[PDB]
């Protein structure tokens, strides 16, 4: 795929240890709002996503701590904010019914399918979604010109592989064919992150209502 790389990733030391490397669900949500405003994001736009997403995480964490509802580190879909601000715009978040499945397994239950077949919903069924699997969250999308892609706020090489080197950055990867993106996502989840065939993934389609 084609790649746009940020200059850094969410574990960068510029983020306070309070939020460092815990912001991915917020970064994925912020990405989908910014990408909806403009598909052709530049590297500096992804940097801005990481900055605003970290700020959102810190605000939500503070809110739940004042309410005594903070125990774990990565915010789940239930703890995501209901409103989000980009550069100049503000949106209410519409959470749609979640989809669940397994990376490769397809239990005889029948209802839940594997990742490849579940993500077929991106052809028309929906355009923007958060994808959580094995404690890692990414954003997946179908863009205005019918391309498929995802945004990964973790430490990645330009081609989307995990790296522990300080050269790793967040990346957005864009594909002409959905099948190519599915293969890449399986390389990420099962190759780089070593997640097993029976690992469950959680898909949250989101839409945005502009409130200026």
* Domains of the chain, CATH where assigned: 2-210 (3.90.70.120)
Q: What experiment produced this structure?
A: X-ray
Q: Pairing relation of β-strands 136-142 and 128-133?
A: antiparallel
Q: How far apart are CA 97 and CA 77, in angstroms?
A: 11
8 Å CB contact between 94 and 45: no
What does the CA dihedral 17, 20, 25, 30 come to, rounded to 10 degrees?
110
Q: How far apart are CA 190 and CA 81, in angstroms?
A: 30
Give the residues across from 148 on adjacent strands: 142, 175
Report the length, in residues, of the chain: 212
Q: How far apart are CA 64 and CA 62, in angstroms?
A: 6
Q: Pairing relation of β-strands 136-142 and 148-156?
A: antiparallel
- 162: helix, coil or strand? strand
Q: Which two three-digit tokens encode residue 74? A: 């990565």
8 Å CB contact between 186 and 115: yes
Give 182's DSSP letter: H
Q: How far apart are CA 69 and CA 76, in angstroms?
A: 12
Q: How far apart are CA 6 and CA 22, in angstroms?
A: 17
């Amino acid at each position: 795929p084609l790649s746009v790389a940020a200059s850094h990733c969410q574990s960068d030391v510029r983020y306070d240890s309070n939020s460092r490397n815990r912001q991915c669900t917020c970064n994925a949500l912020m990405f989908l709002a910014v990408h909806n405003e403009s598909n052709q994001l530049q590297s500096a736009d992804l940097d801005c996503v990481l900055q605003k997403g970290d700020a959102v995480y810190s605000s939500v964490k503070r809110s739940l701590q004042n309410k005594g509802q903070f125990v774990h580190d990565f915010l789940n879909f239930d703890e995501l904010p209901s409103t989000i601000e980009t550069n100049s715009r503000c949106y209410n978040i519409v959470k749609h019914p979640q989809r669940f499945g397994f990376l490769k397994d397809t239990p005889a239950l029948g209802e839940y399918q594997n990742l490849e077949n579940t993500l077929q919903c991106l052809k028309s069924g929906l355009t923007d979604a958060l994808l959580l699997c094995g404690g890692s969250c990414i954003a997946v999308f179908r863009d205005r010109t019918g391309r498929f892609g995802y945004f990964d706020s973790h430490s990645r090489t330009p081609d989307g592989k995990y790296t522990g080197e300080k050269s790793g950055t967040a990346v957005m990867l864009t594909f002409l064919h959905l099948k190519a993106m599915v293969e890449k996502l399986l390389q990420l989840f099962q190759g780089c992150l070593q997640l097993s065939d029976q690992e469950q993934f959680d898909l949250l389609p989101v839409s945005f209502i502009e409130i200026t």
